[PDB]
Amino acid sequence: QVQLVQSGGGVVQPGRSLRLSCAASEFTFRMYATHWVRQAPGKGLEWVALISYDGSNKYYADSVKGRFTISRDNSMNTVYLQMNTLRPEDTAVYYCARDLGGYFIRGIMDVWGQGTLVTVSSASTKGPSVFPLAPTAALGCLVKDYFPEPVTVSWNSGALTSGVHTFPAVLQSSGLYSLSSVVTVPSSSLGTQTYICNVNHKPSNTKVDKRVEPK
Amino acid sequence: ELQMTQSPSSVSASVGDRVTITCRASQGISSWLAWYQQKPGKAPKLLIYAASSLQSGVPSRFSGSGSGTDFTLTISSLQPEDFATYYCQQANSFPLTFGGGTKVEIKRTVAAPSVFIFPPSDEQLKSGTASVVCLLNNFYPREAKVQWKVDNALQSGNSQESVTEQDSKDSTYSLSSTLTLSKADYEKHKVYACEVTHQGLSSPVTKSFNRG
How many whole angstroms from its chain centre is CA B31? 30
CB within 8 Å of B56: residues ≥ 6 apart: none
Q: What is the CATH number of domain A1-122?
A: 2.60.40.10
* Interface check B120 vs A, CB under 8 A: yes
What pairing do the DSSP bridges indicate for beta strands A10-12 and A116-120? parallel
With contact defined as beta carbons under 8 Å apart, do B101 and A45 qualify?
yes
Sheet holding A206-211, edge to edge: A152-155, A196-201, A206-211
**CATH architecture entry for B1-107:** Sandwich (2.60)
Strand A116-120 relative to strand B4-7: parallel, antiparallel, unpaired?
unpaired
Span between the terminal Cα atoms of chain A, in Å: 56
**What are the structural domain ranges in chain B?**
1-107, 108-212
Element (H, E) at B20: strand B19-25
Using a CB-CB distance cutoff of 8 angstroms, which residues of chain B are in contact with residue A140? 118, 133, 135
Q: Which residues of A touch B160 (CB under 8 A)?
A: 170, 172
Pairing assessment for the beta strands B85-90 and B102-106 based on DSSP bridges: antiparallel
Instruction: Return all residues near A75 (Cβ < 8 A) that are at least 6 apart.
Output: none
Contacts of A187 in chain B (CB under 8 A): none
A1-122 and A123-215 share one CATH topology? yes
The answer to whether residue B49 neighbours chain A at the CB level (below 8 Å) is yes
Among the listed residues A57, A62, A63, the one whose alpha carbon sits nearest the alpha carbon of residue A105? A57
| CB neighbourhood size of A125 (10 A) | 12
* AA identity, residue A11: V
DSSP letter assigned to residue B81: G
Domain residue limits, chain A: 1-122, 123-215
Decide: A7 and B63 in contact? Cβ < 8 Å: no
**Hey, how many other C-beta atoms are within 10 angstroms of the C-beta on A8?**
15
Domain A123-215 sits in CATH at: 2.60.40.10
User: For residue B123, which residues of chain A lie inside 8 Å, CB to CB?
Assistant: 131-132
Nearest to A129 by CA among A165, A176, A82: A176
Largest CA distance in chain A: 71
DSSP annotation of B68 = B
Which of A106, A134, A168 is opposite residue B118, by nearest beta carbon?
A134
**Are both B1-107 and B108-212 of the same fold?**
yes
Q: Which amino acid is at B47?
A: L
Nearest partner of A212 among A153, A150, A132, A117, judged by Cα: A132
- Residues in A lying within 8 Å of B, measured between beta carbons: 35, 37, 44-47, 50, 59-62, 95, 100, 106-110, 112-115, 129, 131-134, 138, 140, 142, 144, 165, 167-170, 172, 178-180, 182, 184
Q: Which residues contact A174 (CB under 8 A, 6 or more apart)?
A: none
What is residue B65's three-state secondary structure? strand
Backbone phi, psi, residue B200, to 5°:
-75, 5
CA distances from B127 to A124, A144, A145, B122 (A): 19, 12, 12, 9
Report the CATH number of the B108-212 domain. 2.60.40.10
Dihedral of alpha carbons A158, A140, A184, A196, sign: positive
Over its C-alpha atoms, chain A yields an Rg (Å, rounded) of 22
C-alpha angle B112-B115-B118 in degrees, rounded to nearest 5: 165
How would DSSP label each residue in chain A? --EEEEE--EEE-TT--EEEEEEEESS-GGGS-EEEEEE-TTS-EEEEEEE-TTS--EEE-GGGTTTEEEEEEGGGTEEEEEE-S--GGG-EEEEEEEESSSSS--S-EEEE---EEEEE-S---BPPEEEEE---EEEEEEEEEEBSS--EEEEGGGTB-TTEEE---EE-TTS-EEEEEEEEE-STTTTTS--EEEEEEGGGTEEEEEE----
